[PDB]
Each structure stands twice: as structure tokens, then as C-alpha cells.
Amino acid sequence: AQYEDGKQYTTLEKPVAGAPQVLEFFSFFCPHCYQFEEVLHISDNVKKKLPEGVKMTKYHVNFMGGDLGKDLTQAWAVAMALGVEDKVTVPLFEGVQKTQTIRSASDIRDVFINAGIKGEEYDAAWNSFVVKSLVAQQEKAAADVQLRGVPAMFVNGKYQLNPQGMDTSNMDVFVQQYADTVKYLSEK
Structure with a gap:
């Protein structure tokens, strides 16, 4: 399929009940987190594509x-x-x-x-x-x-984003794949 478990995302063997819909973790010490937030604006592009009624949570x-x-x-x-x-x-x-x-x-x-x-x-x-x-x-x-490890993003306590299965040649295209994947998972 186009989205396949183990490629753009993984499934938690041990699902978390009552988790936030979209949950992102970061650290202010984390170099990739700096890229995510300051250069890629991942949180923001994810948000712009989330279906109505699903909120975003971000934790340090x-x-x-x-x-x-x-x-x-x-x-x-x-x-x-x-x-x-x-x-x-x-x-x-x-x-x-x-x-x-x-x-x-x-x-x-x-x-x-x-x-x-x-x-x-x-x-x-x-x-x-x-x-x-x-x-x-x-x-x-x-x-x-x-x-x-951070950065990390989880959807409904069940799915974890896997950005390492994504092309990074273009920064714009990676961000939208990431965002589109979150939306996909969120409609699952």
C-alpha cells in the first residue's frame, strides 16, 4: 500500500489508552528538534492539515x-x-x-x-x-x-511517525509528506 506500517509509521505493540490525539515530543537541546521547529515548521504544517476536532499537544x-x-x-x-x-x-x-x-x-x-x-x-x-x-x-x-529519543510524534497512542522512511532532498516535500501522514493516521 501507499502508507505501510513499518515504513512511514510504526504501531506501538503496547497501545496507550487515553493518549492525546496528536502528541509531539521535543527537547530544546535536541538539534533535529531545532530543525523541526525553526526550519521545517513541522508542528505548524501538521496543524494546518489536521481534520476538524483533533487537537495538538506538544511536550518537552x-x-x-x-x-x-x-x-x-x-x-x-x-x-x-x-x-x-x-x-x-x-x-x-x-x-x-x-x-x-x-x-x-x-x-x-x-x-x-x-x-x-x-x-x-x-x-x-x-x-x-x-x-x-x-x-x-x-x-x-x-x-x-x-x-x-526526540523529535517524536504519536497519533492516538497507537502510531508513531517514522520520518526516516522519507526523502529529504527537498525540505518542503518532506514536511508535507510528514503532515499528510499524520492526517492519514488521524483518519485511521
């Missing part, structure tokens, strides 16, 4: 970058809680990988401040139990799918 992971890596999962929880993801995603990626000016929790905080989030507001969120549970949600989703 702990297993890259050590201590700063966990800080970034907590910051991403703050980003989700305040709804400021589209204001901090670019400066966090560039701060960690381009300028390498993010070296501490305080440097992460600076990015949110630069972005117009008030200090009081950031700190209150950082220390909140609502953010603690969002950190918990991210860690559990990653644990549920055996997650050991």
Missing part, C-alpha cells in the same frame, strides 16, 4: 541536557500554563542552541521576561502546583510510550 522531555533539561521541562510547563508557547519557543531554541546564552534557570527566566511575561507572573507560575502537575503530565506521556 527530561532525558537531554541534564539539570538544565529538567528546568526546561518545567519552563515549558510554565509556557503552557500561561499560553505563551509561541512567544518563547524561538528564543529558547536559539538561546540553548544558537547563541548558547541559556545556561541556568535564571537565563531561561530572562527569555520569558524579554518576551513580556512579568517576573511576578513567571515566578508564581514556576512555583505553582498547576505547573507541577503539567510537568507530571509531560513526564507520564513520555513514560507511557517508552520514549528514548
Whole structure:
């Protein structure tokens, strides 16, 4: 067939009940994740092609970058809680990988401040139990799918995208194949 299990996607032998419809994992330390988000805009092109009524969830992971890596999962929880993801995603990626000016929790905080989030507001969120549970949600989703590498995308807790079965000669064409595959899986 055109889409075949084991080629553009794999099926989880051990399906995850109650998972988000479309779930993407990344790390701000992850070089391919930087490409995905900053150069390819995968999340966005996927979204533009998802059928109506299917929402997109994106979580940060702990297993890259050590201590700063966990800080970034907590910051991403703050980003989700305040709804400021589209204001901090670019400066966090560039701060960690381009300028390498993010070296501490305080440097992460600076990015949110630069972005117009008030200090009081950031700190209150950082220390909140609502953010603690969002950190918990991210860690559990990653644990549920055996997650050991990023970037990664899962559809309905049952299917995992397999971009390595895709031509990358053209960047535009790869992104749409990726997006079209997510839509296919989402209609399954």
C-alpha cells in the first residue's frame, strides 16, 4: 500500500489508552528538534492539515541536557500554563542552541521576561502546583510510550511517525509528506 506500517509509521505493540490525539515530543537541546521547529515548521504544517476536532499537544522531555533539561521541562510547563508557547519557543531554541546564552534557570527566566511575561507572573507560575502537575503530565506521556529519543510524534497512542522512511532532498516535500501522514493516521 501507499502508507505501510513499518515504513512511514510504526504501531506501538503496547497501545496507550487515553493518549492525546496528536502528541509531539521535543527537547530544546535536541538539534533535529531545532530543525523541526525553526526550519521545517513541522508542528505548524501538521496543524494546518489536521481534520476538524483533533487537537495538538506538544511536550518537552527530561532525558537531554541534564539539570538544565529538567528546568526546561518545567519552563515549558510554565509556557503552557500561561499560553505563551509561541512567544518563547524561538528564543529558547536559539538561546540553548544558537547563541548558547541559556545556561541556568535564571537565563531561561530572562527569555520569558524579554518576551513580556512579568517576573511576578513567571515566578508564581514556576512555583505553582498547576505547573507541577503539567510537568507530571509531560513526564507520564513520555513514560507511557517508552520514549528514548526526540523529535517524536504519536497519533492516538497507537502510531508513531517514522520520518526516516522519507526523502529529504527537498525540505518542503518532506514536511508535507510528514503532515499528510499524520492526517492519514488521524483518519485511521
